Amino acid sequence: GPHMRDSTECQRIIRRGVNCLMLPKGMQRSSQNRSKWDKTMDLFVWSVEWILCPMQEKGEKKELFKHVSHRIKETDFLVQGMGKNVFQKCCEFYRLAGTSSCIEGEDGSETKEERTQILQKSGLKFYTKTFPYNTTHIMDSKKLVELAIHEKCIGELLKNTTVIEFPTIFVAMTEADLPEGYEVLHQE
> What DSSP assignment string belongs to the chain?
---S--TT---EEEETTEEEEPPPTT-HHHHS---EEETTTTEEEEEEEEEE-----SS-----EEEEEEEEETT--HHHHS-HHHHHHHHHHTT-------TTT-SSHHHHHHHHHHHHHHT-EEEEE---TT--S------EEEE-TTT--HHHHHTT-EEESS-EEEEESSTTTSPTT--B----
Name 80's Cβ contacts closer than 8 Å, sequence gap at least 6.
Answer: 72, 73, 112, 115
Q: How far is it, in rounded angstroms, from Cα 7 to Cα 164?
A: 16
* Pairing between β-strand 162-164 and β-strand 18-21 as defined by DSSP bridges: parallel
Instruction: Of 45, 39, 41, give the one whose Cα is nearest residue 16.
Output: 45
Sign of CA dihedral 171, 77, 79, 83: negative
143 close to 130: Cβ distance less than 8 angstroms: yes
Helix axes 84-93, 109-122, angle to 10 degrees: 30
Torsional class of 91: left (φ above 0), alpha (ψ -120 to 50), beta (otherwise): alpha
Give CA angle at 65 (62, 67), nearest 5°. 170
CA-CA distance, 28 to 117, in Å (whole number)?
Answer: 35
Q: Burial of 8 by CB count in 10 Å (0-12 exposed, 13-18 middle, 19+ buried)? A: exposed
How buried is 169 (Cβ within 10 angstroms: 0-12 exposed, 13-18 middle, 19+ buried)?
A: buried
HSE-up of residue 136 (Cα within 13 Å, Cβ side): 0
Q: How far apart are CA 156 and CA 79, in angstroms?
A: 15
> Angle at Cα 23 formed by Cα 5 and Cα 27, nearest 5°?
90
Question: Rounded to the nearest 10 degrees, how much is the dihedral formed by the CA atoms of 55, 141, 79, 68?
Answer: -90
Give the Cα separation of 109 and 95 in Å (integer).
24
CA distance 156 to 31: 26
* C-alpha pair distances (Å), 59 with each of 56, 62, 64, 65, 176: 8, 10, 16, 20, 12
Method: NMR
| Category of 107 on φ-ψ map: left (φ > 0), alpha (ψ -120 to 50) or beta | alpha
Instruction: Write the single-letter amino acid at 30.
Output: S
